[PDB]
Design a protein around this ligand. Sequence first.
Ligand code: HEM
Ligand code: HEM
Ligand code: HEM
Ligand code: HEM
Length: 107
Amino acid sequence: APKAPADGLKMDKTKQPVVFNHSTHKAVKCGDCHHPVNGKEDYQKCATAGCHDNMDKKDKSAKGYYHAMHDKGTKFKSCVGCHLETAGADAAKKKELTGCKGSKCHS
Ligand code: HEM
Ligand code: HEM
Ligand code: HEM
Ligand code: HEM
């Protein structure tokens, strides 16, 4: 069975890189992020060719990498989508978890 990697993973496909820590996401099943593709949970890097490899941040199709990390109403939760739900009405948590700058994702 796949094992989570070490904390401090840098997502760095863009000029706004973001650190991801598995240890803070244990309340989330692995396959909610490493989601099924052709019926099997896929543990490849999200931006693998044929996956979320479109680096046009304006693309709203499934292959758009920005879209996959930021948008609501997606088939699997995005980073920002799930964080918005988590923050609820708490403005401090909305800033920490969903702010576009000065958040835990982007400085
Ligand atoms: C569940 C305990 C779980 C496992 C297992 C797991 C594994 C895993 C691997 C093996 C990697 C490395 C991939 C590589 O080859 O680079 C990896 C990377 C990322 N993960 Fe993960 N992961 C588990 C859980 C979760 C959860 C719950 C989320 C989403 C909240 C998540 C996300 C990520 C992300 C993002 C990465 C980086 C991918 C990248 O493209 O570099 N994982 N995980
Ligand atoms: C990496 C951990 C990773 C993330 C994060 C992720 C997210 C993601 C979202 C949010 C969606 C929904 C988009 C929408 O509804 O518009 C989505 C959908 C698909 N993904 Fe993905 N995804 C990650 C990893 C991977 C990998 C490694 C591949 C390629 C093997 C891949 C592919 C796809 C496909 C295909 C879809 C659409 C699925 C369907 O319609 O059932 N993703 N992903
Ligand atoms: C998507 C790849 C993604 C990123 C990036 C991400 C980041 C992130 C950070 C930076 C934190 C703060 C703690 C830390 O420094 O590790 C954090 C915390 C929470 N997250 Fe997250 N997160 C990503 C995705 C997801 C997904 C898809 C969910 C829900 C399904 C989720 C949830 C949470 C929760 C819960 C926390 C803790 C919140 C807190 O108040 O402490 N994240 N994540
Ligand atoms: C707030 C809604 C918000 C904005 C706006 C935003 C912007 C942003 C940009 C411009 C990029 C780079 C896109 C490109 O291709 O040039 C980027 C990248 C990532 N972001 Fe973001 N972002 C906002 C908020 C958040 C939050 C709160 C998280 C974490 C939950 C987050 C995550 C990510 C991830 C992951 C990336 C990709 C990192 C990489 O691979 O380089 N964003 N964002």
